[PDB]
């Protein structure tokens, strides 16, 4: 989707036995706060004896990128369901925002594994600080010194249906 990173905090409803239950935080990549709070309860019931009916959302906050114009490399740890089983995988993405790497991930597993949004768990998104942290060659090839490349065969978009001159692709 078009996503945002949210900080969602929730807890079990206080009881006279437990008047200050533990506060649990999750980082959720969701298009809006309605899905952000929905995804939160989805993962807490995978981890704790809690429900939306027996729990309480305490805080929902957008987490903005720290340096949105600094180019980073992200490692994303995934747990997705295929047609046959459940698999763990790790992939890497280059982007300037943490959210935009997760958006690329969702497009990428849709394209390479036919994995829908419902079939994916994001275990962890980590910015790889060191160039030695980069394991995948499809993003390591852009970390070489003095990187240059042309864009051969440029196709120019025309406003008109008919053109009176021969087409060209220089660039």
């Amino acid at each position: 989707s078009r996503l945002n990173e949210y900080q969602v905090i929730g807890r079990n409803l206080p009881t006279e036995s437990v008047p200050e239950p533990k506060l649990f935080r999750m980082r959720i990549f969701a298009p809006n706060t309605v899905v952000a709070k929905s995804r939160y309860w989805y993962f807490l019931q995978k981890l704790h004896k809690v429900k939306k009916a027996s729990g309480e959302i305490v805080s929902v906050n957008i987490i903005s990128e720290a340096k949105p114009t600094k180019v980073k490399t992200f490692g994303i740890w995934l747990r997705y369901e295929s047609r046959s089983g459940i698999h763990n995988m790790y992939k890497e993405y280059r982007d300037v925002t943490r959210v935009g790497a997760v958006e690329t991930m969702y497009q990428d597993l849709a394209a390479r594994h036919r994995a829908r949004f419902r079939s994916i768990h994001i275990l962890k998104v980590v910015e790889l600080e060191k160039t030695d942290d980069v394991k995948r060659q499809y993003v390591k090839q852009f970390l070489t010194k003095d990187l240059k490349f042309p864009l051969p065969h440029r196709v120019q978009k025309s406003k008109k249906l008919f053109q009176a001159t021969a087409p060209t692709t220089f660039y």
Partner: protein
């Protein structure tokens, strides 16, 4: 994976002048000139110096990268064809019936005429490609020498001669008769 860039380096010997313009390679050497069109491939060329040429593929996938070292090898074969030549030697293999091979000329064209192959009355004729020289070896009994500047033409004439002498309706493990390429080298020994 779309490799960002892949490179190969041609090496040009001292007397050879490669010449590339719009993926049309013209290699000139002491032995003559050879030309090759590579318009079916998306490659670019950079002259590093008079002894090296860079061959590059930009943002190429696995197969388009695979087509790069073959471009290098084809141009290298052109280079070694105009400076050393190519020589394929064929040996005549027969158990009973001697194979009578002659270099004949009919209608102004050179032909290799194979007779008596496995005793057959049929006369096999193989057209000799342009730029390719056939010779019956004097130093060796039952040997044909296929030589020329173009490796592709030389090897294809050798293959024509070998393929026209195939055995039919027999156990070819037993009936091993034929004309086979025994040595693939160069005219100028190194």
């Amino acid at each position: 994976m779309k490799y960002i860039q892949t490179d190969q380096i041609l090496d040009i010997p001292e007397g050879v002048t490669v010449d590339i313009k719009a993926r049309v390679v013209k290699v000139t050497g002491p032995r003559g000139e050879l030309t090759k069109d590579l318009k079916h491939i998306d490659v670019t060329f950079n002259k590093i110096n008079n002894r090296a040429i860079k061959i590059t593929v930009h943002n190429g996938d696995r197969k388009h990268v695979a087509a790069l070292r073959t471009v290098k090898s084809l141009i290298a074969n052109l280079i070694t064809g105009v400076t050393k030549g190519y020589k394929y030697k064929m040996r005549f293999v027969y158990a009973h019936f001697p194979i009578n091979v002659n270099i004949i000329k009919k209608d102004g064209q050179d032909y290799v005429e194979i007779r008596n192959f496995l005793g057959e009355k049929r006369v096999r004729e193989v057209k000799i490609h342009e730029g390719v020289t056939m010779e019956i070896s004097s130093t060796q009994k039952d040997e044909l020498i296929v030589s020329g500047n173009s490796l592709e033409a030389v090897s294809q004439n050798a293959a024509d001669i070998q393929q026209i002498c195939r055995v039919r309706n027999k156990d070819i493990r037993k009936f091993l008769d034929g004309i086979y390429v025994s040595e693939r080298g160069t005219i100028v020994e190194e």
